Amino acid sequence: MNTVPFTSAPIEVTIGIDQYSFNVKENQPFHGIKDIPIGHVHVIHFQHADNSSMRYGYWFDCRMGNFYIQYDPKDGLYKMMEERDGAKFENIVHNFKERQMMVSYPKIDEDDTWYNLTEFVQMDKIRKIVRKDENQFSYVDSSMTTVQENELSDPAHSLNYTVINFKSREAIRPGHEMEDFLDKSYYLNTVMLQGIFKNSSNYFGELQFAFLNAMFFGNYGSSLQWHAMIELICSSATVPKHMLDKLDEILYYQIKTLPEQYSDILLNERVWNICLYSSFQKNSLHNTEKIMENKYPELL
Amino acid sequence: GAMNSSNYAELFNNDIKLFVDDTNVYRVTVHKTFEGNVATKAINGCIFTLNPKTGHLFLKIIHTSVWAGQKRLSQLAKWKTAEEVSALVRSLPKEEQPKQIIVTRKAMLDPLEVHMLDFPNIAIRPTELRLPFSAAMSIDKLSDVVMKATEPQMVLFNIYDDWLDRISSYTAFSRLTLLLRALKTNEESAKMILLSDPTITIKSYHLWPSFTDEQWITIESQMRDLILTEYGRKYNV
C-alpha cells in the first residue's frame, strides 16, 4: 500500500484521490494519503476553496517512484514532486503515519469501481498523451486543450489524444466515400486499431483516460475525445465481439460513476441517442442502455 | 455560410461558383403489381449543375442502369450526385474549377463534402433560397435528351441562350427563376404563355423562344400573373 505525503496544506482545498474527495481547511495539519492500492494508476486532484477555477491534478503510479505534494506559493498550486532518497521518504511517511496526519484511501473490499474505470489505462500511455518527459507523473487541468482543438495554442501544454475526424482523408478511402462514411469499420479496424493503437487495449485505455479527465477536471476536449471514440465503434458495422462486450462494461461503469448533477455538461445527447438507438451497435450495449435509461431518461 | 437574400449579388461576382440540384437524379413511377403490392419503376434522371454568372449548365444524365441491383436508392442518389460533381470538377482545368458549390438541398452537404476532400479550398454551401431547378425537366429540349439517353452522358447547355448579350447575369438569373417557378407551378399554362404567338420560335441552338426586349417584359408579366393566379387558387385568396 503506497503513500503520497504532503509537506503541508497552506490553502483551503478540496482534494480528490480517484473517485474520492475530502475538504482540507487552510493550515489544517494534513500530511497526505496512505493505503493507496498498488496495481492501478491513480489521480490526485485539487479544486481551491477560494477559486474553483482551474481544477488540476496529477496522474501517477506508486510503482514508478516515491511521490509527494508540496504547495508552491509563487505559482499558487499544489505540485507533485518525486523524492529520489528512499530512506528519507520512508522516514517522513513513518512520522506522518505515527502522528495519524494522513487520510486512508477509502476502498471498500467488494468495490471494483476504480479497476473497472482504469482497466486499460497505463502510465506509459498517459505520458505520451501528456508530454513532460522529466517527470514520471502527468499534470492535467480543466483548461488544457487537445491537439485537435488547437488545429481548429501552446503545443507543450496540449493533450495529445489521437485525432478522430469522420470527414477527413484519414477516415475515407478515395473510391469508398459512401461506404466509409456510412460504415466506419475501415477507419476503426485498419486505420485506428491495426495502424495507430496496435490493439483494442490501447484504444480502450485512451477512451478511459479521456472520460476520467472529462469527469475529474471538466476538461471539455477530453469529453469530445471520449464521445468520438465511442461513436467510432458504434458507427462501425464490423467490430470484434470481444470489443463490443468490453465496451458495454467500460461504458456501464463510466455512466454508473458520473455525478447525476454533471449529466447535462458531461453527456452529448446526439452521440448517446445515435449510439444506443440508431447505430450498427444499437443492440450490442445492453448493460449501458439499461443504466442510461434508468439514470438519465431525460437525455434520451 | 448559407447563401440567402442578404448575399444574393455574390452569385454574379467573378468567383466561379456552381449550383447543384439533385431533385431529378432518382425519378420513379409508382404502380400496383399483379398481386396488388406496389412497385417503383425508375426513369432516366439528371444532375443540374449551373454556373449562375455565365449560364453554363452541365447536365449529367443519370441512366436507369446505375440503379440496377442497388439498395436504398434515395440515399445512393445523393452519393452518386456527389461522385459526379467531384468528377466534373476534376475534369475542368484548374482556372475553370469553382471556388464554391452551392447545393439546393441540405442533404447533399455531407455527400459532397466527403467526395471533395481533395479540394479543401472549394467551399460547399447550402442556401436559404427556394430555387425552382426541379422544373428543369419542363424545358422540352432538356427533358428530351434525358429521356432518349441509352447510357450515362454529359450534355452542355447555356440555360440563358444569348440573353447575356442584352442583360446582366443578375437579370438573366431572375428571368430563369421566374420561368422555372411558373413551369413548376402550372406547367401547361406556362408553356402556353411561351409558345402562344407562333411567329416567335426557338432557335435550333436555344432552349427558350427568341423574344424581343419588349416581348420579354410581356412574358415576364404573364408569368408573374400565372404564379399569383395559382397562389389564389391554392389558398382560396
From Swiss-Prot, chain A:
The gene is AAR2. The lineage of its organism: Eukaryota, Fungi, Dikarya, Ascomycota, Saccharomycotina. Heterodimer. Interacts with PRP8 (via RNase H homology domain and MPN domain), competing with BRR2 for the same binding site. Component of a U5 snRNP complex that contains at least the U5 snRNA, PRP8, SNU114, AAR2, SMB1, SMD1, SMD2, SMD3, SME1, SMX2 and SMX3, but is not a component of the U4/U6-U5 tri-snRNP complex. Changing residue 236 to D/E: Disrupts interaction with PRP8. Residues 244-265 are annotated as: Leucine-zipper. CDD domains: Aar2_C, Aar2_N. GO terms for biological process: spliceosomal snRNP assembly; spliceosomal tri-snRNP complex assembly. Keywords: Cytoplasm, mRNA processing, mRNA splicing, Nucleus, Phosphoprotein. Transmembrane segments: none annotated. This is A1 cistron-splicing factor AAR2.
Curated annotation (Swiss-Prot), chain B:
It comes from the Eukaryota. It is found in: Nucleus. Changing residue 22 to A: Reduced growth at 30 degrees Celsius. Strongly reduced growth at 16 degrees Celsius. Strongly reduced growth at 35 degrees Celsius. Residues 7-237 are annotated as: RNase H homology domain. Changing residue 104 to A: Reduced growth at 30 degrees Celsius. Strongly reduced growth at 16 degrees Celsius. The MPN (JAB/Mov34) domain has structural similarity with deubiquitinating enzymes, but lacks the residues that would bind the catalytic metal ion. Functions as a scaffold that mediates the ordered assembly of spliceosomal proteins and snRNAs. Required for association of BRR2 with the spliceosomal U5 snRNP, and the subsequent assembly of the U4/U6-U5 tri-snRNP complex. Functions as a scaffold that positions spliceosomal U2, U5 and U6 snRNAs at splice sites on pre-mRNA substrates, so that splicing can occur. Interacts with both the 5' and the 3' splice site, as well as the branch region. Has a role in branch site-3' splice site selection. Associates with the branch site-3' splice 3'-exon region. Also has a role in cell cycle. Present with 468 molecules/cell in log phase SD medium. Component of the U4/U6-U5 tri-snRNP complex composed of the U4, U6 and U5 snRNAs and at least PRP3, PRP4, PRP6, PRP8, PRP18, PRP31, PRP38, SNU13, SNU23, SNU66, SNU114, SPP381, SMB1, SMD1, SMD2, SMD3, SMX2, SMX3, LSM2, LSM3, LSM4, LSM5, LSM6, LSM7, LSM8, BRR2 and DIB1. This is Pre-mRNA-splicing factor 8. It comes from Saccharomyces cerevisiae (strain ATCC 204508 / S288c) (Baker's yeast). The chain holds residues 1836 to 2069 of 2413 of the full protein.
